[PDB]
Design a protein around this ligand. Structure first.
Ligand SMILES: *[C@@H]1O[C@H](CO)[C@@H](O[C@@H]2O[C@H](CO)[C@@H](O)[C@H](O)[C@H]2NC(C)=O)[C@H](O)[C@H]1NC(C)=O
Ligand SMILES: *[C@@H]1O[C@H](CO)[C@@H](O)[C@H](O)[C@H]1NC(C)=O
Ligand SMILES: *[C@@H]1O[C@H](CO)[C@@H](O)[C@H](O)[C@H]1NC(C)=O
Ligand SMILES: *[C@@H]1O[C@H](CO)[C@@H](O)[C@H](O)[C@H]1NC(C)=O
Ligand SMILES: *[C@@H]1O[C@H](CO)[C@@H](O)[C@H](O)[C@H]1NC(C)=O
Ligand SMILES: *[C@@H]1O[C@H](CO)[C@@H](O)[C@H](O)[C@H]1NC(C)=O
Lengths: 49, 206, 49, 49, 49, 49
């Protein structure tokens, strides 16, 4: 049960195969729910399933 | 003077990642295949208004331009925002400043911040007390006009500031920039596999 | 009016055949509260009754 | 991402009027809160301040 | 629209929306079923022809 | 859920419910009619076979 910058939620986190842009935080779906985040205090990028 | 604003008036509208999807959005944009007013660096500093954001660019590689001037009267009696290039740090300051009819570097503060074969394409926009600065440094080989081709400005800086801006100037130096205006448009954005914009469509063009 | 109606015997005065000017009655400040129901107090100058 | 503290003082019968989207003299001429406002309003009585 | 400000006009309008939209969706559903019936009749008529 | 207590979160959620549910029911109705069309096609195909 994660909480990233106040956005709670549930899922399994894993390392990203994606290439992330250095101003963004959140990758968002057609379903309009978070799919990919960046750590609020680390530079690693995590895919949310 | 006028040239054709081909397609390089486009940027990422938000800080939200997407990949391999065509996402409609609406934001301020420079409309495709409209005019963009052109000017020349001589030795002047012509008077330009700030209208719901501004597109700016300069074909240069030698930094004749030293920075930018933003304000609303420019007489040390308003809170005018200034950008200056030190050649070490793009510095932004928000203080009342004394200006003339040829103010530049050549041969009550409330903010401090320390940061031709190339187009140094920049976009500035002021909304809800946010002053957002975008950029791109791209290679070319032509010089008279911006070429046919695609480019995607990325954000560099989000300064929240909160002063009114409705006019601007720009710095020259003693030792051929462009300008256009953004307006409300619905746009379609094609994020690719990498998550970078590659092409877009101005929904109300034709 | 210098003398008012009691709530037991409350006064109903009627208004017609005139041009209203509520804006000067609004825009002046002498009133603890100014509430309107089904209608917004700024908008009365637009309608016509 | 940001927080703005909007500081001032006001009379008591006029904090009936400070609410967002609520009309009135102070709300429309002096200081306005949008109808889509999000945030907190604090008020405390001042009798020795 | 001619008698209210934003925060309450939006409410009354929204009441109208949920229900005009409902009427439209009812009409669509009826027409769809009626069209399917008409299709069956048309295929029969083509068969007869 | 991450920004409100019960009595108002329930309201905002309820706004979402009446409308997500409506979307689902629309989808169901469309699929049902489409299925009936497909049935007609299938009976025709069985007849041809
Ligand atoms: C933006 O700053 C400008 C000044 O450039 C303000 O514009 C003035 O507004 C008043 C309205 O009371 C007019 O009488 C002036 O003529 C305007 N000046 C000019 C030069 O057009 C403006 O108030 C500021 N922005 C906002 C939203 O208030
Ligand atoms: C918070 O922890 C992170 C570690 O990733 C660090 O970047 C930051 O400076 C720390 N802040 C402190 C110690 O307050
Ligand atoms: C810009 O296009 C508009 C209308 O198409 C026109 O006003 C303007 O003069 C054009 N550019 C030039 C060089 O004339
Ligand atoms: C950059 O920063 C300050 C601002 O004027 C100055 O001390 C320094 O010399 C500048 N750098 C140069 C001229 O390279
Ligand atoms: C700015 O400094 C000047 C000094 O001339 C002073 O008169 C003025 O009150 C100060 N504040 C502003 C916002 O101008
Ligand atoms: C996007 O990713 C692919 C990996 O298959 C890579 O070949 C391509 O160069 C990347 N695009 C950019 C603009 O780097």
């Amino acid at each position: 049960n994660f909480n990233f910058n106040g956005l709670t939620g549930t899922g399994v986190l894993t390392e990203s195969n994606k290439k992330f842009l250095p101003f963004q935080q959140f990758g968002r779906d057609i379903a309009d729910t978070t799919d990919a985040v960046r750590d609020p205090q680390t530079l690693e990028i995590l895919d949310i399933t | 003077a006028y040239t054709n604003s081909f397609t390089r008036g486009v940027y990422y509208p938000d800080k939200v990642f997407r990949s391999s999807v065509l996402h409609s959005t609406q934001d301020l944009f420079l409309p495709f295949f409209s005019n963009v007013t052109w000017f020349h660096a001589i030795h002047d500093n012509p008077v330009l208004p700030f209208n719901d954001g501004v597109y700016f660019a300069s074909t240069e590689k030698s930094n004749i331009i030293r920075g930018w001037i933003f304000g609303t009267t420019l007489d040390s009696k308003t809170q005018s925002l200034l950008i200056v290039n030190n050649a070490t740090n793009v510095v932004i300051k928000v203080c009342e400043f004394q200006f003339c009819n040829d103010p530049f570097l050549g041969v009550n503060c409330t903010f401090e911040y320390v940061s031709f074969k190339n187009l140094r394409e920049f976009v500035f926009k002021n909304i809800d007390g946010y002053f957002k600065i975008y950029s791109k440094h791209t290679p070319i080989n032509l010089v008279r006009d911006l070429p046919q081709g695609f480019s995607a400005l990325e954000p560099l800086v989000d300064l929240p500031i909160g002063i009114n801006i409705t006019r601007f100037q720009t710095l020259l130096a003693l030792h051929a920039y462009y300008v256009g205006y953004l307006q409300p448009r619905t746009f379609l954005l094609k994020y690719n596999e990498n998550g970078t914009i590659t092409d877009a469509v101005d929904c109300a063009l034709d | 009016a210098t003398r008012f109606a009691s709530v037991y015997a409350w006064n109903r005065k009627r208004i017609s055949n005139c041009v209203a000017d509520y804006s000067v009655l609004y825009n002046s400040a002498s009133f603890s509260t100014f509430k309107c129901y089904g209608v917004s107090p700024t908008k009365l100058n637009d309608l016509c009754f | 991402t940001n927080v703005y503290a909007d500081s001032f003082v006001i009379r008591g019968d006029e904090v009936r009027q400070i609410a967002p989207g609520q009309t009135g003299k102070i709300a429309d001429y002096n200081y306005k809160l949008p109808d889509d406002f999000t945030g907190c309003v604090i008020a405390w009585n001042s009798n020795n301040l | 629209l001619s008698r209210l400000d934003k925060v309450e006009a939006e409410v009354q309008i929204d009441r109208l929306i949920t229900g005009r939209l409902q009427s439209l969706q009812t009409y669509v559903t009826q027409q769809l079923i009626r069209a399917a019936e008409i299709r069956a009749s048309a295929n029969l008529a083509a068969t007869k022809m």
